[PDB]
């Protein structure tokens, strides 16, 4: 495991007093949630919730009360920070339709006004291909005029077209691997091709923080699932040794296969995976590697070929390379790259290849045009400029925030910047105070992150010029002063 | 225990099985059809012009100029990509308009929009059904329903296809098991998962008795209307309108917008009490990007066209009647389907010992028909994974666009080819 | 300028004690509970605890 | 496991009083052996034993005393019943040179007289091919005149001749298997081809009573050795199931191979192996079979092809068929038969094929002539008569002894007849009382049999006409009356 | 623990490895030489007449008319088979006469006769050495000695070939380990197992220092004289007569009668105190048939011929001297052996990377020599099993029968063939 | 004919008690030991054990 360039990442620890105050806040919310539920049960207070129809009251209750506890008493209070209905192209600036609630977020009414020119830090266009004008849009319009929107049958039967073959060969040339196959949903890609590779009698070693698609795909297959600590290579090595030695749990036979599920960039944490050590342990212990590159396929790398170019390694070492066109290339879809044996086996035994409708034609045209723009096949220098500008934006933004006194996670080269808030009231407060200042931020808490660590994730882009970053930094500094979000000991 | 030396030499011995088994080269699924141009009526498959009898386009809305114009307008407005989940700046206004249009069209309170047709019913079932519950799923249920049931950890009970005696038998046995232990029976929910018009058979489910069984035995019906959404009923609301059953008795109606509406996606409609749980516990909804705006606008325009003239359902019904009546008389094949079903099957009357020989006989029939300018397709299943694996069968799909003469010629072509090949 | 300082202190109280999310009557309930408990403890200290603690506090203040 | 003909075998149990008296006798012998050893140590009594040379008295004692206890105090008292120096062809009647000891069996002096016409019941010529005249002897004389006695080099280098190839093809035709290879010693055959087949990581399931060659061959190879009860198919099945399930002892990996070592006829017991059940369990549990047919290759079977013809089974089911020419065919040697893959692997990787001198030419000529006589290739009816006469002799002898009141072991069809004595004085007494009446018998005790069960093994032959059997039966009846050897409850 | 069902399905999965691995077809050991007629001087190998330079027949006693006549007389008397072990009517009078003749010839008390040359020293060692004892065996010890040591469970210590510094080093380390624990050192016996003239090298062991080391360090010498029994010394008593060492110092001298005497078998000679244990604890003796009488009479007649004229040892010595002196000068080969050794080696001066290439080069030399009417052979070893595996080497064997001219021609033929092939 | 019967009984004794193998002085040692122990037990029964056992034996004999 050799790192040609330095690999420095900082996850500063939760303070003491902040953890104590987080716990006090969660306790207050829990007690008052119990009180509100008690008042709701005795019908002393009117409830703005739907109730099962009168002819089905004798049925077993569909939802158990405690199951939805956190949803009704905590999430519903700050629900206004999510599902914001934008009404324009999600470029560097997006138009958000204004909505207000008189029932304390139980029901939303859309006021007439639309908020214009909101700086967008929640959209995923890392390379800034989300535009309503350009070569990609005109090509998609041509394909829409000719082929039409949507295909009406599965790939195997009649739903395979020429555009799908063009996209698959283009992807195979892009990554550098021998062959690749394209699907209509990255979630579907994971959940429908992980069960094909492994089965009963195999071990799946998955990271602590994997996307729900990878966990669901592992669960659907019968393979035993063991979880190692997030980017802790000692734990991976110990698990590999114990798995190879002690064999299966009950009948201590050797494992048929051992598969390691890892991601390129973990969106919440922002940490890049230690790929060279993963490949070293893989080759040493004869395991197989599944690499989800949803977030790193267009961002990382001097020419944006992924994380394997970023580290400089060989794409042929990674066994299965998943990926998604939603983030960078600006069009929904997914893909899997590997050797031709793997691709043929998947083309035969993939659940979505057999039972699911294939991609749309305008979407594959947009993906093809974006890939040709990145690779320089178009002949113009848009592909080179976007990656350099994204790298400059990432370094500038991370430096400026870390020198203001905040706490930020992840490797210094990852575009996603999770700032940390740590308290349940500040999750709502930060979102509302940003939106009052014309910045859109994504705040995430308990359902997607550990309870104590509540964050505001920024997603940088090549669309953000330096003036937009300057304005966002000024307003984030003002709000951090307002809410006391500067928990950093080392820097100030 | 174990000394170190044998540990390293054990680690050295162990050799893993290859990732992918060597697939045989003579696999019919391996060779795909290369449909140049749009997969419309009078398509071009493998370089041969063929009238399209294989694409689930019942109303002929894929190539309609109004649909294309609406999709182009929305593409000019918003672009191709949404760039985020429905929770993080990924909810456009077209998504809300489409959800409201679906809810109004199906005469219900709420509807929810999924980005992929498989995921809608592979993610609706795991949200409501948890570990310990009981599901009485029909035997001939599509793969999406099977994977949805597997994703949840409930106890699956498969009854015979469209056989209410078997369902009532299972329900009574469950009543006895409930009376054995009441404390557990107080916290167990019972679901009946059925499909409105099965793809694996082409037959329609008897809702008049399913509703009565649900009301008598304290169950909850989950209906999948994918294939019957836009084809069945005077106004094309599904099987509930065909039977006249009230829309409230059925809890959750899940369908996909890919077949009749001709735009990728899926949707589940129901009362807000049932639907609002999916916005937070539906994995295909929370953890994936939203539907691209152009597809949503295409679906809205398709819904408009369905709402304007409801005669296309009648003409599709009469074309299904004509082709089903004409197909009676194949020497070597039998028709598996109904005079109302749009897409039905042609199976082998007398099956040989091996399934592969049946598959290759049907493939010979398909190829000979294709050379004669009629494009058919064979039903494709995952043999290793299906719980109830249907017999191999050619698939015949009907549509409002195919003329009467094309239907008669398709019947005659299939007759001659099947009599020759089966001889 | 003192009033703005006091108002921001109160806002910090709301943020820290999770009362920011709660409806106004919930805030009144919690504030009344806190003041009641504090007054009870103050009376208990007045009657049971020695006045030397009060002397120490007065010395610290001045 | 189907037996076309009945499979009846009787092993009558040791009586009570006989076991008690055996133990009392062994106790008396042990106490007086201790007393004699004590007198020998204190030099009170002169010892007729060699002592280490005076320059090597300070060396560590070569033999530990207790190790040789049984040899000096029990075996030496009745040593005169073993190593009898015959001086004629061991046919139906052999000439034994007379020897006497004045030092109580410590040293033997050969008196002039030679005992003539001793009925021989200790020699192994089941088919009676041990003659000094006949076609076989003349053919061996021709080969001796031409080739000469003994070959002077290993098989691989220059010691392979044409006679060896003729013998190997003839053996392969005889048994019916595809190929076979010939060695110069059956002991060497086992001890030098068992280690080639198996190694570390394999299991060897050996019978309770196997010849020392099979045990030595199993020990030389590293395979784990487990012993199942003698001809107890329940124990074999349990061992097979536990071995396949629980795997290797320490690291519970699956076994590379499982090998079952069995014999045709067990010489001491006289019991024929339950071959059909062995093959049934072999096929069911996917094991391999090694079948030593030293005693059954010329005796058992309607035409004497072994025990596989006796049971009527297929020779192709038995994986490795060992065998020995010493017993029936009247010439020293050994052989292994099997499929050509096995024979080629042995011709390459057999210890004796590489490092040991091959067979002699006159011996292979004698084996070839005997096999051609048995198979009827000679054209004369000697091959048919000998097997029928041996079967008649076996049935007649076993019936007559079992109806006199003795105890006899083994299947009713095996030529070896172990009569049972049970006491340590009667072992010597029976041998001496037989030899006084002109019968030669083989008496065996503790070193080769369990301590309580001491036997006198008879080996029948096709040379024994009915008059010889009548005389031997009369004298055995007289001696059994004399020594009280009739311990049978059921018959008298 | 484990339920039954998984037990049967485990038993069903398990598939054993094949009994015999697939041997490569291009194995030189697989093709054997078919020596038509007797393997005497001027033999016929593979259809080509060749002067025999490959058979261990040092004195030329295989084809001697007296030996054949004696064997024929004994065959007429007793027959071919003995039909029993030495304990059960299998001890003829010729066996006792041969044992006595061997004991008188070697000037010792007792000798014991084994039916197979390998078994004599594969069964002498396990009888005396038990678990816990120490054996200082030479490194270049034949396979029979290695299997004898493995059969017993003693602790084997291999010292360097003919290197008394290494033996003294091992003995001193054992003295230290003894002083560490005296109670165990009182019941441990120390053996030095050496060979009189090694087959793997052709060199002779230094008994003058082995005897002194034995007497100083309380050890016991087991000597294997197989190759030196009938060739070395004025009267051919082995290496003890060549060195003049007393016969009593060596405990057990084991040899085989196959090489010089030209009759199958083996024998161990020594004092009765040592030998008499083998009659009861020697497995190759107790549990196997006795030597056929004709071979024993042939061995007796060979011993008579050796006792009559002792000049054949001198002539064999001078022929070994002549051939060893002439073989100096091969371009590509080196002589590994001594001017006294009858059978020595020709090895490759500079070895290639792979042993197989050396093996095939030597095989080419052997074949080219055979076509020129000189029959050589290559030393054959078990590569997987040898503890110390010697380099590949042609083997040159000398005998009293080969004329001087045949020796000169053999030297010249090997020179020309080796220079041509190695070029 | 009684003497031959007694002699064969003695021979059976030698066979059963393994004394057949032992040298004559070993037989004399064992016989003396047996007779000594038997006489000691007989004296012990005479002095300690009741005479009713002797009466029972006499009744059995007659």
């Amino acid at each position: 495991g050799l790192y040609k360039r330095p690999f420095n990442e900082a996850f500063e620890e939760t303070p003491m007093l902040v953890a104590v105050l987080t716990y006090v806040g969660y306790g207050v919310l829990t007690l008052f949630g119990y009180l509100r539920d008690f008042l709701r049960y005795w019908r002393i207070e009117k409830c703005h919730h739907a109730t099962e129809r009168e002819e089905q009251k004798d049925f077993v209750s569909l939802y158990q009360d405690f199951e939805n506890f956190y949803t009704r008493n905590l999430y519903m209070r700050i629900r206004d920070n999510w599902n914001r209905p934008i009404c324009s192209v999600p470029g560097a600036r997006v138009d958000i339709m204004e909505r207000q609630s008189h029932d304390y977020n139980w029901s939303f009414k859309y006021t007439g006004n639309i908020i214009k020119g909101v700086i967008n830090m929640g959209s995923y266009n890392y390379l800034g291909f989300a535009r309503n004008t350009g070569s990609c849009q005109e090509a998609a319009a041509k394909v829409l005029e000719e082929y039409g929107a949507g295909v009406c049958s599965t790939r195997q039967e009649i739903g395979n077209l020429d555009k799908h073959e063009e996209l698959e060969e283009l992807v195979a040339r892009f990554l550098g691997v021998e062959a690749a196959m394209a699907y209509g949903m990255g979630f579907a890609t994971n959940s429908m091709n992980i069960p094909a590779l492994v089965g009963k009698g195999c071990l799946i070693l998955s990271d602590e923080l994997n996307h729900a698609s990878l966990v669901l795909g592992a669960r659907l297959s019968g393979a035993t699932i063991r979880i190692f600590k997030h980017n802790n290579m000692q734990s991976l090595e110990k698990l590999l040794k114990d798995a190879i030695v002690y064999g299966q749990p009950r009948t201590r036979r050797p494992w048929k296969k051992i598969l390691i599920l890892v991601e390129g960039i973990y969106s919440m944490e922002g940490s890049i995976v230690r790929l060279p050590e993963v490949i070293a342990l893989k080759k040493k212990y004869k395991a197989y590697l599944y690499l989800d590159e949803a977030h790193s396929i267009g961002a990382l790398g001097p020419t944006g070929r992924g994380v394997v170019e970023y580290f400089g390694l060989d794409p042929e070492d990674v066994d299965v390379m998943m990926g998604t066109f939603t983030k960078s290339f600006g069009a929904s879809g997914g893909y899997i790259g590997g050797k031709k044996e793997l691709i043929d086996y998947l083309r035969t035994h993939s659940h979505s290849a057999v039972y699911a409708t294939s991609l749309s034609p305008p979407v594959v045209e947009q993906i093809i045009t974006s890939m040709k723009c990145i690779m320089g096949q178009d002949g113009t220098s848009l592909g080179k400029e976007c990656v350099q500008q994204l790298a400059e934006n990432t370094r500038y933004f991370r430096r400026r925030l870390k020198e203001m006194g905040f706490i930020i996670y992840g490797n210094e080269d990852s575009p996603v910047v999770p700032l940390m808030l740590y308290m349940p009231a500040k999750i709502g407060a930060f979102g509302r105070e940003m939106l009052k200042r014309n910045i859109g931020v994504v705040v995430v808490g308990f359902p997607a992150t550990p309870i104590i660590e509540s964050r505001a994730r920024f997603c940088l882009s090549a669309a953000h010029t330096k003036e937009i970053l300057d304005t966002a930094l000024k307003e984030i500094d003002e709000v951090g002063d307002l809410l006391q979000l500067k928990y950093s000991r080392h820097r100030l | 225990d174990l000394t170190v030396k044998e540990k390293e030499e054990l680690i050295e011995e162990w050799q893993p099985e290859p990732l992918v088994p060597p697939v045989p080269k003579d696999h019919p699924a391996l060779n795909y059809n290369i449909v140049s141009g749009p997969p419309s009526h009078k398509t071009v498959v493998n370089g041969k012009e063929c009238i399209n009898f294989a694409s689930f386009n019942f109303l002929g809305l894929l190539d309609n100029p109004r649909v294309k114009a609406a999709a182009l307008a929305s593409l000019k407005k918003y672009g191709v990509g949404t760039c985020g989940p429905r929770g993080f700046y990924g909810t456009f206004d077209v998504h809300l308009d489409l959800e409201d249009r679906l809810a109004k069209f199906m005469k219900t309170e709420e509807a929810i929009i999924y980005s992929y047709g498989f995921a809608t019913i592979a993610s609706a079932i795991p949200a409501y059904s948890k570990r310990g519950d009981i599901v009485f799923v029909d035997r001939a249920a599509c793969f999406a329903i099977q994977k949805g049931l597997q994703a949840s950890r409930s106890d699956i009970k498969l009854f015979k296809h469209n056989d209410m005696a078997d369902l009532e038998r299972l329900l009574k046995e469950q009543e006895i098991e409930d009376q054995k232990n009441p404390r557990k029976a107080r916290v167990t929910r019972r679901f009946i998962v059925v499909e409105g018009l099965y793809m694996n058979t082409g037959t329609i489910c008897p809702l008049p008795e399913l509703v009565k069984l649900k009301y008598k035995y304290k169950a909850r019906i989950f209906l999948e209307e994918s294939l019957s959404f836009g084809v069945l009923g005077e106004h094309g609301r599904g099987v509930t309108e065909h039977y006249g059953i009230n829309i409230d008795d059925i809890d959750l109606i899940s369908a996909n917008m890919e077949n009749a509406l001709a735009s990728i996606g899926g949707f589940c409609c129901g009362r807000s009490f049932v639907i609002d749980h999916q916005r937070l516990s539906g994995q295909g909804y929370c953890f994936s990007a939203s539907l691209p705006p152009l597809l949503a606008a295409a679906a809205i325009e398709a819904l408009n066209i369905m709402e304007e003239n409801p005669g296309i359902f009648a003409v599709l019904k009469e074309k299904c009647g004509q082709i089903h009546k004409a197909l009676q008389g194949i020497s070597g094949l039998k028709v598996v389907g109904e005079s109302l079903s749009p897409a039905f099957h042609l199976q082998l009357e007398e099956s040989t010992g091996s399934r592969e020989q049946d598959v290759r006989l049907l493939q010979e029939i398909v190829d000979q028909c294709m050379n004669r300018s009629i494009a058919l397709t064979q039903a494709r299943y995952l043999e290793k994974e299906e719980k109830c694996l249907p017999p191999p069968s050619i698939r015949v799909v009907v549509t409002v666009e195919q003329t009467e003469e094309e239907l008669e010629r398709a019947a005659s072509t299939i007759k001659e080819v099947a009599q020759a090949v089966l001889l | 300028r003192a009033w703005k300082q006091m108002s921001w202190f109160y806002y910090q109280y709301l943020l820290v004690t999770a009362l920011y999310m709660l409806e106004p009557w919930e805030r009144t309930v919690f504030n009344s509970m806190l003041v009641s408990i504090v007054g009870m403890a103050l009376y208990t200290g007045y009657v049971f605890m020695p006045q030397h603690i009060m002397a120490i506090l007065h010395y610290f203040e001045i």
Side-chain angles (χ1 to χ4, degrees), chain B residues 40-45 48-52 370 373-375:
Chain B
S40 64
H41 170 264
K42 281 173 182 171
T43 185
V44 168
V45 181
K48 297 177 294 295
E49 285 80 16
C50 313
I51 296 171
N52 189 179
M370 211 164 297
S373 181
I374 300 294

Side-chain angles (χ1 to χ4, degrees), chain B residues 194-223:
Chain B
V194 290
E195 181 156 359
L197 186 64
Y198 300 94
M199 201 165 48
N200 299 0
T201 314
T203 61
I204 189 178
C205 71
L207 270 190
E209 284 88 7
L210 281 176
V211 167
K212 276 146 59 170
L213 265 50
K214 171 178 81 72
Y215 272 122
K216 186 183 286 185
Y217 290 81
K218 307 273 158 289
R220 288 194 170 87
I221 295 181
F222 286 179
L223 190 69

Side-chain angles (χ1 to χ4, degrees), chain A residues 422-434:
Chain A
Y422 287 126
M423 305 169 162
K426 296 195 175 188
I427 303 173
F430 192 58
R432 302 188 191 142
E433 288 297 324
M434 291 325 278

Side-chain angles (χ1 to χ4, degrees), chain A residues 154-162 165 347, chain B residues 28-36 44-46 54 363 366-367 370 376-378 380:
Chain A
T154 318
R155 281 280 292 278
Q156 280 197 1
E157 309 182 11
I158 199 166
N160 187 358
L161 278 72
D162 53 355
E165 305 287 357
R347 277 165 76 103
Chain B
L30 198 47
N31 288 5
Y32 284 36
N33 290 318
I34 302 299
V35 185
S36 310
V44 168
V45 181
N46 294 330
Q363 183 68 41
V366 168
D367 292 343
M370 211 164 297
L376 290 166
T377 184
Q378 191 202 140
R380 308 289 180 183

Side-chain angles (χ1 to χ4, degrees), chain A residues 50-53 55-56 58-64 68 71 75 82-90 96-97 110 120 122-125 130-132 137 140-141 144-153 155-158 160-162 165 184-185 187-188 192 197 211-212 216 219-220 241 244-245 254-258 285-286 288 319-320 326-327 330-332 341-342 344-345 347-349 351-358 360 362-363 366 440-442 444 457, chain B residues 2 7 10-12 14-21 23 27 29-30 32-39 45 52 54-57 62 68 71-72 75-89 91-93 96 115-116 118-119 128 143 147 150-151 153 185-191 214-215 218-220 248-249 251 258-259 262-264 271 273-274 277 280 283-285 287-290 292 294-295 298 377-382 385-386 395:
Chain A
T51 56
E52 206 166 357
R53 36 190 303 264
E55 292 87 13
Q56 286 186 0
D58 51 357
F59 286 9
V60 173
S61 51
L62 181 51
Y63 312 126
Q64 315 297 153
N68 300 351
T71 292
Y75 167 78
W82 289 290
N83 301 95
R84 287 179 177 176
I86 79 182
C87 63
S88 181
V89 58
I96 302 180
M97 295 194 317
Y110 303 89
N120 193 1
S123 281
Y124 280 132
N125 51 18
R131 292 177 314 262
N132 60 6
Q137 188 260 357
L144 185 64
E145 271 176 70
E146 183 191 2
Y147 282 54
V151 61
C152 285
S153 179
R155 281 280 292 278
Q156 280 197 1
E157 309 182 11
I158 199 166
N160 187 358
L161 278 72
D162 53 355
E165 305 287 357
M185 206 202 191
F187 195 98
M192 272 155 168
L197 305 181
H211 195 247
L216 177 61
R219 282 207 307 106
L220 285 186
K241 295 185 308 180
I244 295 179
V245 169
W255 295 103
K256 298 216 213 311
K257 279 172 291 194
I258 295 186
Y285 291 93
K286 285 154 297 190
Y288 297 105
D319 293 332
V320 189
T326 308
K327 316 299 195 308
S332 298
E341 272 86 39
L342 173 68
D344 291 309
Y345 177 74
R347 277 165 76 103
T348 305
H349 301 87
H351 307 288
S352 62
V354 177
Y355 298 103
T357 299
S358 59
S360 181
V363 163
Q366 215 276 347
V441 296
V442 164
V444 295
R457 213 203 58 219
Chain B
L2 258 66
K7 288 196 305 178
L10 280 159
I11 297 172
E12 182 46 289
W14 180 79
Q15 202 78 352
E17 173 188 338
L19 191 61
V20 286
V23 61
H27 208 294
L30 198 47
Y32 284 36
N33 290 318
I34 302 299
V35 185
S36 310
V45 181
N52 189 179
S55 63
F56 294 102
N57 185 1
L62 172 145
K68 283 181 185 180
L72 172 60
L75 158 68
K76 260 146 85 179
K77 273 193 52 61
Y78 304 93
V80 192
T82 48
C83 282
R86 285 285 293 265
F88 304 157
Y89 304 80
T91 311
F92 288 68
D93 58 356
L96 307 167
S115 177
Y116 201 56
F118 204 113
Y128 303 129
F143 200 55
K147 295 291 105 177
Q150 184 189 23
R153 272 73 42 93
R186 298 159 204 180
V187 289
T188 298
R189 309 177 288 266
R190 301 150 190 92
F191 301 111
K214 171 178 81 72
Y215 272 122
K218 307 273 158 289
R220 288 194 170 87
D248 286 349
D249 303 352
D251 293 335
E258 300 169 349
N259 293 342
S263 82
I264 320 294
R271 289 190 58 256
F273 176 70
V274 187
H277 185 240
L280 261 173
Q283 272 173 326
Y285 184 95
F287 298 110
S288 176
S290 61
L294 72 164
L295 305 183
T377 184
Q378 191 202 140
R380 308 289 180 183
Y381 311 106
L382 282 181
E385 294 294 328
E386 289 283 328
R395 176 174 287 154

Side-chain angles (χ1 to χ4, degrees), chain B residues 140-355:
Chain B
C142 58
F143 200 55
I145 294 185
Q146 300 181 5
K147 295 291 105 177
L149 295 174
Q150 184 189 23
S152 64
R153 272 73 42 93
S154 57
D155 291 331
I156 297 101
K157 305 203 176 303
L158 291 86
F159 65 101
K160 293 186 180 64
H161 178 88
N162 281 352
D163 206 1
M164 310 315 188
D166 205 56
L167 185 51
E168 206 179 16
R169 177 182 70 86
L170 287 178
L171 290 170
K172 287 177 174 303
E173 295 181 4
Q174 178 56 30
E175 274 201 342
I176 296 178
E177 190 277 331
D178 287 344
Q179 278 179 85
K180 183 178 184 293
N181 186 0
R183 186 156 303 270
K184 179 183 300 299
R186 298 159 204 180
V187 289
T188 298
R189 309 177 288 266
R190 301 150 190 92
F191 301 111
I192 312 175
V193 181
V194 290
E195 181 156 359
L197 186 64
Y198 300 94
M199 201 165 48
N200 299 0
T201 314
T203 61
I204 189 178
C205 71
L207 270 190
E209 284 88 7
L210 281 176
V211 167
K212 276 146 59 170
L213 265 50
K214 171 178 81 72
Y215 272 122
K216 186 183 286 185
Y217 290 81
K218 307 273 158 289
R220 288 194 170 87
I221 295 181
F222 286 179
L223 190 69
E224 169 91 344
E225 273 188 357
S226 287
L227 233 122
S228 51
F229 170 54
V231 298
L232 271 172
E234 290 197 354
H235 297 174
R237 260 178 289 273
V239 64
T240 71
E241 178 160 355
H242 165 67
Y243 275 121
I245 293 303
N246 188 306
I247 194 81
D248 286 349
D249 303 352
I250 321 296
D251 293 335
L252 181 90
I253 286 159
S254 44
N256 63 336
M257 294 182 286
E258 300 169 349
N259 293 342
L261 296 187
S263 82
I264 320 294
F267 83 93
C268 305
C269 65
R271 289 190 58 256
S272 183
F273 176 70
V274 187
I275 295 300
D276 291 331
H277 185 240
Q278 270 176 99
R279 305 208 180 272
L280 261 173
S281 179
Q283 272 173 326
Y285 184 95
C286 298
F287 298 110
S288 176
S290 61
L291 192 64
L294 72 164
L295 305 183
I300 292 180
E301 190 63 54
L303 276 162
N304 283 358
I305 297 174
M306 293 177 70
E307 290 186 8
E308 314 277 330
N309 56 339
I312 52 175
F313 313 102
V315 75
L316 171 51
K317 190 158 299 184
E318 83 171 345
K319 291 188 184 320
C320 295
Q322 280 150 342
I323 186 51
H324 209 285
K325 179 180 173 298
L327 273 185
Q328 313 291 347
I330 311 290
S331 174
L333 296 164
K334 66 177 176 186
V335 180
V336 170
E338 307 213 7
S339 299
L340 61 84
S341 180
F344 49 83
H345 291 232
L346 277 159
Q347 316 199 359
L348 280 174
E349 282 189 9
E350 298 152 6
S351 174
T352 76
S354 57
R355 177 187 178 86

